[PDB]
Paper text:
Kaposi’s Sarcoma-associated Herpesvirus encodes ORF74, a viral G protein-coupled receptor homologous to CXCR2, which plays a crucial role in Kaposi’s Sarcoma development through its high basal signaling activity. ORF74 was identified as a homolog of the chemokine receptor CXCR2, which is a member of the class A GPCR subfamily. ORF74 has been shown to have robust and high basal activity for multiple signaling pathways. In this study, we present cryoEM structures of ORF74 in ligand-free, BRIL-fused ligand-free, and CXCL1 & Gitrimer(Gαi/Gβ1/Gγ2)-bound states, providing an inactive-active pair of structures of a vGPCR, allowing comparisons and insights into the likely conformational transitions.
The CXCL1-ORF74 complex was purified from HEK293S GnTI- cells. This complex was then combined with a recombinant Gαi/Gβ1/Gγ2 heterotrimer (Gitrimer) and stabilized using an anti-G protein scFv16. We used single-particle cryoEM to determine the structure of the CXCL1-ORF74-Gitrimer-scFv16 complex at ~3.0 Å resolution. CXCL1 binds the extracellular surface of ORF74, inserting its N-terminus into the extracellular cavity between the TMs (a clear density for the side chain of R8 acting as an anchor could be seen), while its body interacts with the extended N-terminus of ORF74. On the intracellular side, TM6 is closer to TM5, facilitating the Gαi/α5-helix insertion into the intracellular cavity formed by the TMs. Extensive electrostatic interactions between ICL2, ICL3, and the bound G protein heterotrimer is seen, which contribute to ORF74’s high basal activity as discussed later. In contrast, ORF74 only forms hydrogen bonds between R3.50 and Y5.58, but not with C351 of the Gαi subunit. In contrast, ORF74 exhibited a 17° tilting movement of Y7.53 in conjunction with TM7 towards TM6, rather than a rotational movement, accompanied by a corresponding movement of P7.50. To investigate the impact of these structural features on the GPCR-Gαi complex, we performed a structural superposition based on the Gαi/α5-helix. We observed that Gαi bound to ORF74 is tilted towards ICL3 compared to other structures, a feature similar to that of the ligand-independent constitutively active BILF1. The RMSD between the two structures was 0.6 Å, indicating high similarity.
Numbering used by the authors:
A (entry chain F): 1 to 73
B (entry chain E): 30 to 331
C (entry chain C): 9 to 61
D (entry chain B): 5 to 340
E (entry chain D): 1 to 121, 124 to 235
F (entry chain A): 4 to 55, 182 to 233, 241 to 354
Write the structure that this text describes.
Amino acid sequence: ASVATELRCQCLQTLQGIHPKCIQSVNVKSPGPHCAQTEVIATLKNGRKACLNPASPIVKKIIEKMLNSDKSN
Amino acid sequence: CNFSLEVSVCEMTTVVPYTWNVGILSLIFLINVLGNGLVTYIFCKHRSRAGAIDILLLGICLNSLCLSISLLAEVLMFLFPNIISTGLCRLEIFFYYLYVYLDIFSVVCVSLVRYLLVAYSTRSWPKKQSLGWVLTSAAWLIALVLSGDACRHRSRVVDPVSKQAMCYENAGNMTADWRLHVRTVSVTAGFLLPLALLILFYALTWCVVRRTKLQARRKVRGVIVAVVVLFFVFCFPYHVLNLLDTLLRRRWIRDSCYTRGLINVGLAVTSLLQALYSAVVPLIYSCLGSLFRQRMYGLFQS
Amino acid sequence: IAQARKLVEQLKMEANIDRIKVSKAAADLMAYCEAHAKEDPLLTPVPASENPF
Amino acid sequence: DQLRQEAEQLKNQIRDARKACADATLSQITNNIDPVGRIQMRTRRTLRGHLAKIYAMHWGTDSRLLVSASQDGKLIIWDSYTTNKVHAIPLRSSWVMTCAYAPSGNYVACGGLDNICSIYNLKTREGNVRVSRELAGHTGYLSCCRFLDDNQIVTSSGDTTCALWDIETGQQTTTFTGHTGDVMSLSLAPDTRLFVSGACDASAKLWDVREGMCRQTFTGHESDINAICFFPNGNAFATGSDDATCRLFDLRADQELMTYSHDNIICGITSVSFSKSGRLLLAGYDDFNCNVWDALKADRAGVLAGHDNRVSCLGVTDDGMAVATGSWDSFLKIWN
Amino acid sequence: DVQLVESGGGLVQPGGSRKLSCSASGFAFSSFGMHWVRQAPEKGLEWVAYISSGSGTIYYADTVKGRFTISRDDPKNTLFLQMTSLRSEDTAMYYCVRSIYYYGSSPFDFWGQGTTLTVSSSDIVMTQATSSVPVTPGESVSISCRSSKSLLHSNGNTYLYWFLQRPGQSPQLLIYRMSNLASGVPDRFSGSGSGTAFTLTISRLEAEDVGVYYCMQHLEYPLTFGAGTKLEL
Amino acid sequence: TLSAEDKAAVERSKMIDRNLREDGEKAAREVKLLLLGAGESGKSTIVKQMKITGIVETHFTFKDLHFKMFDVGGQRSERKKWIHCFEGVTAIIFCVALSDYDLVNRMHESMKLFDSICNNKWFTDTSIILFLNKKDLFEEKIKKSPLTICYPEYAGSNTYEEAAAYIQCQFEDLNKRKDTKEIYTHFTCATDTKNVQFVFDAVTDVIIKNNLKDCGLF
């Protein structure tokens, strides 16, 4: 009787436009059966989190800049 | 930097622990096995005079095998994490839906047989065993069709790393529409239409009995109201909470973390409530009778 | 009337048979029961290979 | 009226004669024998197929075939070993309350409140069971019937008489009278020269088949006698009655010698039987169970697992292999 | 009395079809399952087909299956045997036998008068030697029948049968299950034997019981018959 | 494992079982009735109007239903043994004559008989029907004297309807065990020729009740 289990997209949001380099770190979130569409979530040293919108005119610029620090120092 | 310090994201929620749920399900298994064992024992003692209703109830007794197989499929994975497969979960969920659905149509046929043997008493076919076997076959075919429709896209899923290897629907591109479709089919084919048929059949039975002056008027009304209201009480919660969840993901209900946990725990508890009803169906129908009550004394006083 | 007279002279026919001590009858019954106690299975059941039921 | 004086004087004289014979009760003499232990009998074959309650049943000499009569108007001949049906005879009336099976297996008997004894032929060349003779000399319901041989039969009726029939000519040969009430019990002796019967007048009488007179009279109980069976030796017989007690009598002593009863049983007795050795006495009570009594020490050795209703008849095979009990469940059960 | 007549014989060209029926009277037809038996002009008997009460079971011989068919019409008490694609070797006289099976029954208790059919032109084997046995009236003689496989079934019954066919007459039943005299048979005859050897003894012969004696096995289908032994005066 | 003849015997047994089942189904629609009463009470007038050794039995059908009714008058001894054999009857008919009270008490005997019948050990769950005959003569002759000659504490006015209700409650009140049994009542006369309808209603009620209790598991 595993029907009791449920899954839901892991972000409730009103989030956009945070400065790129004061949000600290990320963990990669990808589409799947839980959420067919794409989804992204970030973190802060504050302890509280900050979900990132998967689609917006800003993310298309944020991707490369956030990736570079991961690939660099 | 130029931003605030806090946000509401609901990455954690009040969740139902797995072992406790399996423990409740094991209690249900015990109360299921004992009840069906007793009822089938008394049925065997008097197999030479069993009417259609008795065969219909005996059909429900096979719930023990389906629930046992589903529980084994549930527990061998927990004991052995690596034994999981993308196909055994279809087996488990198919058996679970067979278990839950098999009761409703059997009780619908029970109501139909009662109506036939009240309105068409002077005849002799409604008291045959052939009608009972045919009705049981129809109920089984309907239950298997419904269960097969439910397990079409049951497979393994990849939850966030460090907590993966759990089973969930994997219909793919149109998964949300499929999860809505399964719920709509389940409600309309397990609760609404069976309820309408059952109400109509008992309405006709009561219309026939009302003219018939007997002291059994109270007994018939009491038993009918008891069974119908019991079915409604123990089945409606699950479907209404599925409706609430479908609203939560169709974006009708204003989102909130506490409410999300409320929905989760309510769905989890209502699943066990429905399992308990499906386990105790045959005992309720057998005990409320008179001949089965008489046959109970012999074993009670041993 | 002769009916009652015949009835009274008829009902005394059962007082002529020979008597017997009860102990003798009990002893005979016990001897018969013990002598044949090795035949029926109802108290000395036979092996399962001899029971036809 | 000195006739009543003579009658009561003879009654007192019989009492005085009987009290002189006893010197040591059977309990004292047999107290030194080992007890029979515990006798547990397990049901092992249930014969299904009747639709209404079963009234009576009877075994055959071969200890493999039995006949059952039911309110459903059918008389079914079973095969105990294989639980198969060899015949199913439809009856004219549904009020059958007795049946019998001839020792040679060529005939069966049926009777009821139709006041007619019907004999059926089982080995006809036609291939189907057909009535041979119907006997309508009685003036009341027939309670029991038993075969001496293929050409003779003894029946007891509610008109307080029992008659012997010559089946060929259909005429009564000898008539037995003396009972004050309805006759309900009858059992033939191993030597067919004698048979006994029971009545509701609380007395069982001993008869002679061909001499047409009563040999001995017994009173015993204080209520209706519903069963009677011969002890195998041929010198005793047990009786059952409504007051919940079974009593064993000895012919050569003309006196009672044992009584069976316990404080926790109050219902009546419907059937009584003995084992082949005579050491056990199976009695079927009204409260959906049957008890087995050690016939020599009066103790209770065991209880047959109860039916779901009253047990109407009880019998034991000629070889002592099994004990068959009929009840109102519409079932028969073989015990061993 | 009890009678059982049949008709439908004649001359049939090879490869054709013919129909014959068995009319029964004087006994309950529906309660008896009935067989068909054949006899060559000079050889012995053979078993063809079987139909049970209610037509729930039907059997055929290994040389008949696919050609013949058996059916019964209970309301009018008439059997039927429709034969197609006949052969030259199929010529034989056909009897119409009846049997009933219940504990203590006497299967094969009646045989029909028979009809003649002419064509223009693993399993148990029963051995019965000494085809010729001279004898005189008043003398005691016996005949021995043998079976390849033991007939002593686990239930305690040996399924063996004996038949006698007087000249110009249908076979009659003598012994069933090796130890029981059939109804109407004289007490002169007797039967005994082990599970593989059998014998039938006539205590005192008479001129009225001269013919051919057959032994038949009824342990498992198909049934088998012996070669028959003649008694000559 | 079975032999050749054992299979045929099993087939014969199955055929016998099929025939017995069919005959039982045929016999589940022939309702049985039992007739009681201190006397004839003109109970044979129904059969005469409808013009359709051992004991007497009559047969008639009405509206695709078979009726067999028996008579207890053939008893030769006490009813203890005579009555128990009729445990399977559907309904039991009892008759009382309303013009047989002042004949040169009988009412007490009838009351005791009704109490013994409806409260009998063997008639555990058998519905009882009451037919009161000779109403046309009862209506007029009540003017001479009421039923006060046998019962005290007579209540109500002299109207025949209230008195009839009083007697109806007099018999009905004997049903101390009405917890398990039903009773129906209906007046009748020698010329109404409408008893069969009331009997039909009663048998329909009993059949429905038995079907609900036996098969429906109510």
